[PDB]
């Protein structure tokens, strides 16, 4: 029933929500590059 919710009222821990296991397959691990370090 219903179409909405207000208030808070944590009466009972309904169900389980373990979220997303935020673990992937790496990224740019820096790697010693260069941009040419000196202006003037």
């Amino acid at each position: 029933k219903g179409k909405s919710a207000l208030m808070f009222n944590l009466q009972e821990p309904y169900f389980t929500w373990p979220l997303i296991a935020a673990d992937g397959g790496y990224a740019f691990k820096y790697e010693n590059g260069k941009y040419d370090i000196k202006d003037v």
């Binding site: 029933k1 219903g2 909405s4 919710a5 309904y14 979220l19 740019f28 691990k29």
Partner: protein, 155 residues
């Protein structure tokens, strides 16, 4: 079901806005010394507040942590607050909505706010996967039924 008339139940957003934004990178100059292998945490939290009669506020606390082992790279906590002026609801179904559906409204805007903070700190975009707990809950209710019925064109 000859009762084709709405009861006191209605879902209505009055305003979505960030009540707090916090990006911390205390080891930001220090990160260059460390290798980029980020272990990402998501700490999910919410709060409610009464602004008026039937007028409530649900604030979403998303916390986004990038830890390089025992060395923090950055942190991103955004309180994406949303006013909802609703009534007529109770039971276990209200817990489903304020616990999942109402912060789900706020979650694209929270995700973005963080993602932009991350990229402004010259770090790579982090796309937080949305958890479709709503469908998981409906599987218990009646599996799934989606009978669409157009009538109310535009307003």
């Amino acid at each position: 079901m000859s009762e084709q008339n709405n009861t006191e139940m209605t879902f209505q957003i009055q305003r979505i806005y960030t009540k707090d934004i916090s990006f911390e990178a205390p080891n930001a100059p220090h990160v260059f010394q460390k290798d980029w292998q980020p272990e990402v945490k998501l700490d999910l939290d919410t709060a409610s507040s009464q602004l008026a009669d039937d007028v409530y506020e649900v604030v979403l606390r998303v916390t986004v942590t990038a830890s390089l082992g025992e060395e923090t790279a950055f942190l991103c906590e955004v309180q994406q607050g949303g006013i909802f002026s609703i009534a007529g609801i109770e039971g276990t179904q209200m817990a489903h909505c304020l616990g999942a559906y109402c912060p789900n409204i706020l979650f694209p805007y929270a995700r973005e706010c963080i993602t932009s903070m991350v990229s402004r700190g010259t770090f790579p975009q982090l796309n937080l996967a949305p958890v479709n707990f709503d469908a998981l809950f409906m599987n218990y209710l009646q599996q799934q039924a989606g009978e669409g019925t157009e009538e109310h064109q535009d307003a």
